[PDB]
């Protein structure tokens, strides 16, 4: 088996049906659609091969190292129910192949070159198991759910947010005025847009100064600890550290970071935020490029697992009822990944492996994108308390102003939490509770008339296969 | 001057009967036997010219000795050594190394002293041959 | 048009058919598949909206800033030939929205949230136009094609490479021995695998020392300048700079970097490489996650355009005849993007916009993945001279050894270049030239017998639409 | 595992062997053996080179490496100390070493010792054709003095430096981080 | 020992008929042909002794061959190479380089190892001739 | 190979009549004439072996020429040069320097290239003689 020539991956020693994975093994699922003629066993072994220690032809240098330990092994292949030509493939990897405390190395191995293979039509990474031995090498999130709520002294309900609208255009003076009117109205957080950085119309260092004056003026007049997600996303790391150090110098509670910057750049801020007492917010920009398609890419639950290990306190996980793509059961899957310390296997919610995080900090999930006061009963029923609800359009787009829009969303949420704890069903009586609160609250009545019939309903692309 | 790089250097030159006994130990434990040669016997010089491929699955000590005599005919005035390679879970390295053939006269080393900052000296070892 | 309520994107002012784009405008193409019922004009305006300055409901803060300048405008929509329900959409963006010298800001705007939209089934970014005003803000590649060849003193043929096999397993001592036998045989470059970093079996600092001794020993015995692509990919930037500084300290010619690390992390090394005289190599790991699918993702030609602006000297562009996905005409498109200073619109090669780079350094493209000595005539005809050909399996997997395998590939290439310049047709006579060279060269004859009928032929997924 | 800090020997000892020994209800207690889980060992970096890594650097295989302690323990001046080292390494020894109590005494300063032994190492290396070494003692009162002794040992081009156990696990883990980042073998 | 600096090195020594064909390709694309010689064939040694001025506007491959034979008579034991120079908007560099005449016996390279900080080595390549 | 260190190097070798005329200019302006010799003609090598003491108060060009012929008899295969020294308020330095006697065959310089950090090279010029 070491003579010169081209041999099949199943014959080379990558497929083993009788193999039982150990407790110290990285497990990965692959939703493989093979080409016409290619066997699913050969398709699995090709994925198991190139992701670890294989090439197209046999080399004599394989006899030097103990290959039986280093080679990844595909152990079982099962057909996906519903689809005629699609297969689940379980691949086991050993800890000897992975670097301690590196997301970049983990992705270079598993999702390296397996996607661009000719014998496969479409491959998708569904779920990934991490052993207890591997999770302990990572530091985890800087604060978590517990650590953040103690800093802000806010308990018993979702934290409210709003994106400063419009996205681009506003100068430093006027940008802070929208922030000031938002936070004083009743919002816990305001934020920068993902594209806002250091544009010619408004410099970053000017924005940072004017929002911090708006935060402290709102904090004095309400008596609450307010915050603004300061966008530090830059071209280089040298610029990025300088933006973060100035954010610390002003005394900001929390800074935001885009997903585009890369896992190597993300892990650097996670180390920085812990060593300077800062809460980290992640905005998933350009995630839908490789997440939305059900047949090809990487499922968000795997990305959420990597981002928990990298060390982020906040993460956008999606809204089931919002303007963006999301299926209620699949969305709840992403929420359970970043919150629960130990999650059991559940096929309707898209969990395939029993994951044990072993005392890593809980990432607080953020629901954002096309939501308002009328959607409040559905949001509280699906997720719970330890979430962040963001109303970008639903606050500023209010007919009365910004202060009234912030009050309308705050009154709506406070009425729902009070009704839920008393023993009233928030799924059925939900709309009636909001109408009853509108009798004494005038800004809430105006908000319900504006966005009453406005609902984003479309067929979800990323759906479950066991329903 | 005699270069003592490797095992059995202080002992007198090993006869073919003694070499055959040493290889028999290496093949018994399950090591790959390889022949290497050079004209530059510098300390910390890692890579010597390999005489073909290492003998991985060979259960005969006589088979190595044929390749050793073939290497002596091709390279008379060179340092020939035997390297036994371990292929286990933790080791993955050379286990035994000993010079079997050394040239008629051993080359000496000249040391050049470059004066840097303070009293520190950079040393350069160079072979006369 | 500023009263509170939900209005359509076409009515809001994002679609304009009579609009003619200016010379200082970032243009983007989108291959949009809309949902059943959604109009292509509305689908275009939704993409044009969210990528710049829009939200689902109208805000009063829009009246503050001059929105007519900041809003992105979709100017024409044309149906894609061949497909019944797919449309090309041309979106124009103004320079006021983009930060000077930042890839991360450019991606946060254009490919931000437009993919995850519910009214769109699948969207793909086909091509992007950059104005002369925008390209000049970027530094470009550290050396280029011209700068690199002058350093190595190698002219008139493709530079040869080989990946050290197997991928993982080899210890520091043995790893350098494969490198030594490769470079002395006739190869110009050896390289680390993309997953190799700092594993428990072999530490990085040990690898760096042993390969550099192997490089210099090969350089003394051949009389050529040899190199090894040293993988610096790490978890954090602090670890990554320390790996690069030690690579400089040994006196290495060229270091390699994975694409996963992120554009923010990439631009930091590009700044470092110029200031320390280093050539940068890019390995595209995990690119096929969002590139391979024809209906959804980002085409590689756009990624190549970003990577040229970021500043990389080498880039894997793909092989038409290799084991990995690639269509001959579409592959040539990626090569023309990174080499040619000015490229005209060509629909068969996938070029849609007339791009003027204005004196940015030429990125040298790398052909790798499942190629051998028998494929030499096809490689030289498709691309040309200013390329890097890498034979990972085709060198070490040789029956005689590593030195013979390196000689076989070198003799094969030298025979083809000599035949091409004399006036012989390398497309037809190609196989006969290699057979005639095998009469005097014995390692080449053994290489042709091993991989003679072995050819990777499969249906390409990423294909042209104008054929 | 919830009780232990990731990558700290000092924290592990503060928990287990903390106050249990000094208890009145116990006459005598002894810690015999300890099991570490796979989850806990991975947090630590481990030895800088190991058995495999060291033997490849010295190019010595198939037998035990030979050493000798420079006698007498204390007394010898910088000039004469190197002469004993020179005669040892040229005779056939792979290593010479400093005594555990030798640091920076009034009779012989450390920076003088470091210079004279390195000349003796290279003279022996040229005459035998083998890579020779001397275990340079870096044990100091403070960490600031200890890093300065190590950086000068690297500057001369020493293969291996030695450290006493007394200095403490917190001080030991600091050199282990330093030796990996500067290619040094730790004794 | 054989110095493989440049193109067509692994192939056998090029005859005058083959050289004339290679220059014809260079003049066809519009490159300036220049002859260079040295006795020091070090790697990364940039500047060789130029034999006159480069032939910019010459549409005959035979004219280069006369200057090549003239250079061989003047310098018998030297490395003669042909450099084709591109003069376009972006290139402005050498495109082709190949040794046409190499001496009777090729000189070897001696490598001197200077030990610096840690385990790092400064390498010095020197020609014996 | 010809070492061009100093004035009048590109001109043909100066005759005794021409040297006497050049010294006459140096003594006229009031400079101290000194003879220096070496076998090591390195660039930036500052100090050559002085032939006695410099002639400070000598108003005859013939007196220098006697000491020049005496130096040629003692050192035939050495580089002899004349140094005119100015002794004013601001100068206090050498004004004229020219080789009057150079050996039968001029020694060449070998350049050794030490590769350091990045692409930087330390150069070492060494005389073959
Ligand atoms: O740009 C936007 O659309 C938003 O500001 C929401 O604004 P509205 O509240 O005005 O819709 C959010 O950034 C998206 O939710 C991001 O997507 P995801 O949640 O998928 O990260
Ligand atoms: O891992 C591999 O397969 C390779 O080493 C090729 O090895 P062989 O030559 O042994 O096939 C390259 O990294 C791929 O070409 C990367 O893909 P791309 O070229 O698409 O970046
Ligand atoms: Mg936003
Ligand atoms: Mg690879
Ligand atoms: Mg002792």
């Amino acid at each position: 088996r070491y003579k010169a020539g081209v041999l099949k991956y199943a014959q080379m020693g990558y497929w083993d049906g009788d193999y039982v994975p150990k407790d110290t093994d990285v497990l990965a699922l692959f939703r493989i659609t093979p080409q016409e003629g290619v066997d699913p066993v050969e398709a699995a072994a090709a994925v198991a091969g190139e992701s670890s220690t294989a090439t197209w032809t046999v080399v004599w240098t394989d006899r030097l190292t103990a290959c039986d330990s280093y080679r990844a092994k595909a152990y079982r292949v099962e057909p996906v129910p519903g689809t005629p030509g699609q297969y689940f493939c379980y691949v086991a990897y050993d800890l000897i192949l992975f670097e301690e405390g590196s997301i970049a190395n983990l992705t270079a191995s598993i999702i390296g070159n397996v996607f661009s293979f000719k014998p496969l039509k479409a491959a998708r990474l569904e779920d990934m198991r991490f052993p207890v031995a591997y999770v302990k090498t990572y530091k985890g999130p800087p604060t978590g759910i517990v650590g953040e709520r103690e800093r802000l002294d806010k308990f018993g309900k979702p934290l409210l947010g709003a994106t400063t609208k419009p996205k681009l255009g506003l100068s430093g003076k006027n940008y802070g005025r929208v922030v000031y009117e938002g936070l004083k109205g009743g919002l816990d957080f305001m934020k920068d847009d993902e594209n806002i950085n250091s544009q010619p119309f408004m410099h970053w260092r000017d924005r940072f100064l004017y929002v911090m004056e708006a935060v402290n003026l709102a904090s004095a007049q309400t008596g609450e600890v307010k915050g603004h997600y300061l966008n530090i996303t830059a071209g280089t790391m040298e610029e990025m550290y300088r933006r973060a150090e100035f954010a610390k110098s002003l005394g900001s509670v929390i800074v935001m970071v885009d997903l585009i910057i890369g896992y190597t750049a993300i892990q650097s801020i996670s180390e920085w935020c812990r060593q300077n007492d800062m809460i980290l917010h992640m905005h998933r920009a350009g995630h839908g490029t490789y997440t939305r398609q059900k047949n090809h890419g990487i499922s968000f639950r795997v990305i959420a697992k990597w981002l928990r290990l990298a060390g982020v306190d906040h993460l956008h996980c999606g809204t089931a009822v919002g303007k963006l793509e999301g299926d209620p059961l699949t969305v709840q899957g992403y929420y359970n990944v970043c919150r629960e310390p130990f999650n059991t296997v559940d096929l309707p919610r898209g969990i395939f492996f029993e994951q044990d995080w072993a005392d890593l900090r809980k990432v607080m999930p953020v629901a954002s994108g096309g939501i308002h006061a009328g959607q409040m009963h559905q949001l509280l029923s699906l997720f719970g308390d330890d979430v962040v609800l963001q109303f970008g359009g639903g606050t500023i787009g209010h007919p009365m102003g910004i202060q009234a829009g912030a009050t309308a969303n705050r009154v709506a949420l406070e009425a729902m939490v009070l009704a839920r704890n008393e023993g009233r069903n928030i799924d059925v009586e939900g709309p009636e509770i909001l109408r009853a609160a509108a009798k004494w609250c005038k800004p809430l009545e105006a908000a319900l008339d504006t966005w009453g019939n406005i609902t984003f309903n479309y067929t979800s692309t990323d759906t479950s296969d066991f329903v | 001057m005699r270069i003592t790089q490797g095992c059995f250097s202080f002992l007198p030159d090993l006869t073919d009967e003694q070499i055959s006994a040493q290889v028999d130990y290496c093949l018994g434990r399950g090591w790959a036997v390889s022949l290497e040669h050079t004209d530059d016997p510098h300390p910390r010089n890692t890579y010597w010219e390999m005489w073909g491929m290492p003998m991985f699955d060979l259960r005969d000590p006589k088979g190595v000795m044929i390749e050793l005599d073939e290497c002596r005919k091709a390279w008379p005035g060179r340092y020939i050594r035997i390297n036994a390679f371990d292929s286990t879970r933790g080791f993955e390295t050379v286990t035994m190394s000993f010079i079997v053939n050394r040239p008629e006269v051993e080359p000496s080393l000249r040391m050049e002293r470059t004066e840097v900052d303070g009293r520190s000296i950079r040393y350069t070892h160079s072979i006369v041959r």
Side-chain angles (χ1 to χ4, degrees), chain B residues 44-116:
Chain B
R44 80 185 291 185
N45 179 230
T46 311
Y47 311 102
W48 295 29
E49 299 290 331
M50 269 191 159
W51 182 260
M53 282 161 73
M55 299 290 177
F56 283 92
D57 195 59
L58 192 72
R59 292 178 188 270
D60 190 45
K62 290 176 182 180
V64 178
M65 298 302 289
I66 305 151
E67 291 290 304
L68 172 60
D69 289 28
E70 197 184 57
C71 193
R72 282 177 178 173
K73 287 176 184 178
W75 308 103
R78 262 182 146 90
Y79 289 89
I80 293 101
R81 70 172 181 188
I82 288 158
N83 294 102
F85 186 82
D86 198 15
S87 300
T88 337
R89 196 180 174 179
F91 294 94
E92 292 169 339
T93 190
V94 195
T95 42
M96 279 195 77
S97 185
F98 56 97
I99 298 171
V100 276
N101 187 229
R102 51 183 70 209
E104 292 171 354
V105 63
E106 283 78 35
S108 59
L109 282 87
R110 285 176 183 173
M111 199 168 77
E112 284 174 49
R113 291 176 199 85
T114 314
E115 293 177 316
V116 205

Side-chain angles (χ1 to χ4, degrees), chain B residues 17-36:
Chain B
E17 285 80 53
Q18 286 186 116
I19 301 153
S20 188
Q22 291 300 123
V23 174
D24 193 61
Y25 173 78
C26 298
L27 302 170
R29 286 191 75 179
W31 300 331
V33 178
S34 184
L35 289 154
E36 283 173 51

Side-chain angles (χ1 to χ4, degrees), chain A residues 379-429:
Chain A
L379 290 156
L380 200 78
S381 60
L382 283 162
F383 316 123
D385 296 302
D386 296 304
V387 290
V388 176
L389 303 166
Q390 284 176 5
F391 305 98
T395 310
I396 306 152
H398 195 274
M400 288 176 77
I402 312 158
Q403 280 192 345
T407 313
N409 292 321
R410 185 79 182 264
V411 165
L413 185 77
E414 277 179 39
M416 291 319 291
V417 174
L418 192 75
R420 192 195 68 187
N421 297 343
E422 277 180 59
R424 290 174 75 182
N425 191 25
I426 57 157
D427 194 60
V428 180
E429 287 178 60

Side-chain angles (χ1 to χ4, degrees), chain A residues 163-196:
Chain A
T163 320
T164 318
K165 300 290 169 185
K167 302 176 87 73
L168 298 127
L170 292 158
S171 61
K173 183 97 168 288
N174 302 295
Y175 200 86
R177 202 169 279 102
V178 187
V179 172
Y180 174 76
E181 291 289 292
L183 296 165
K184 208 200 170 187
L187 291 154
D188 300 312
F189 300 102
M190 290 292 287
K191 75 193 281 300
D192 293 323
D193 199 276
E194 75 281 330
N195 50 45
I196 286 283

Side-chain angles (χ1 to χ4, degrees), chain A residues 50 54-57 113 116:
Chain A
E50 197 69 51
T55 175
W56 62 281
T57 183
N113 295 310
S116 190

Side-chain angles (χ1 to χ4, degrees), chain A residues 19-258:
Chain A
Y19 184 83
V20 181
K22 291 171 86 181
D23 292 301
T24 52
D25 275 315
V26 179
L27 305 169
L29 251 183
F30 288 96
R31 191 195 286 272
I32 293 157
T33 312
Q35 289 284 339
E36 293 180 319
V38 186
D39 201 61
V41 185
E42 188 67 51
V47 172
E50 197 69 51
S51 58
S52 61
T53 54
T55 175
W56 62 281
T57 183
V58 192
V59 289
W60 74 271
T61 46
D62 280 326
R63 285 184 76 97
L64 297 159
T65 179
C67 275
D68 59 299
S69 187
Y70 292 84
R71 284 173 186 182
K73 216 161 275 178
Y75 56 96
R76 81 167 209 266
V77 180
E78 53 179 58
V80 190
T83 46
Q86 208 170 60
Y87 301 95
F88 281 120
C89 296
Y90 293 83
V91 188
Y93 303 91
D94 198 18
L95 266 79
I96 59 175
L97 312 174
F98 303 102
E99 199 196 311
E100 293 161 18
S102 182
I103 304 293
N105 183 248
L106 178 82
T107 43
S109 301
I110 303 151
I111 57 103
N113 295 310
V114 291
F115 282 82
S116 190
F117 260 83
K118 275 182 167 177
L120 320 171
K121 184 84 177 72
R124 205 212 184 189
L125 184 74
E126 282 288 325
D127 202 42
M128 199 172 282
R129 206 279 297 272
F130 300 101
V132 192
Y134 191 71
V135 294
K136 283 291 282 180
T137 57
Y138 295 95
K139 289 178 181 182
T143 55
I145 287 168
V146 175
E148 190 185 35
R149 283 183 174 270
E150 290 160 345
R151 284 184 180 184
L152 302 150
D153 292 299
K154 289 165 186 179
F155 305 99
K157 63 180 176 195
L159 295 153
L160 293 174
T163 320
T164 318
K165 300 290 169 185
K167 302 176 87 73
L168 298 127
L170 292 158
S171 61
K173 183 97 168 288
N174 302 295
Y175 200 86
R177 202 169 279 102
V178 187
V179 172
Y180 174 76
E181 291 289 292
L183 296 165
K184 208 200 170 187
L187 291 154
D188 300 312
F189 300 102
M190 290 292 287
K191 75 193 281 300
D192 293 323
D193 199 276
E194 75 281 330
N195 50 45
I196 286 283
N197 292 135
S198 188
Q199 282 81 20
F201 61 87
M202 173 192 62
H203 188 74
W204 69 269
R205 218 171 200 271
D206 286 42
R207 187 182 70 253
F208 273 54
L209 287 162
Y210 282 108
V211 298
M212 282 302 293
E213 198 170 319
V215 162
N216 285 289
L217 269 156
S219 187
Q221 288 168 320
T222 56
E224 284 183 294
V225 182
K226 305 288 173 187
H228 185 89
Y229 306 156
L230 287 162
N231 207 329
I232 64 150
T233 303
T236 51
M237 288 298 292
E238 285 78 52
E239 289 182 305
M240 202 220 68
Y241 275 112
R242 278 196 275 100
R243 288 186 198 181
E245 279 179 54
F246 184 66
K248 190 205 171 184
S249 186
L250 294 160
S252 64
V253 198
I254 171 151
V255 284
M256 69 158 282
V257 165
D258 297 313

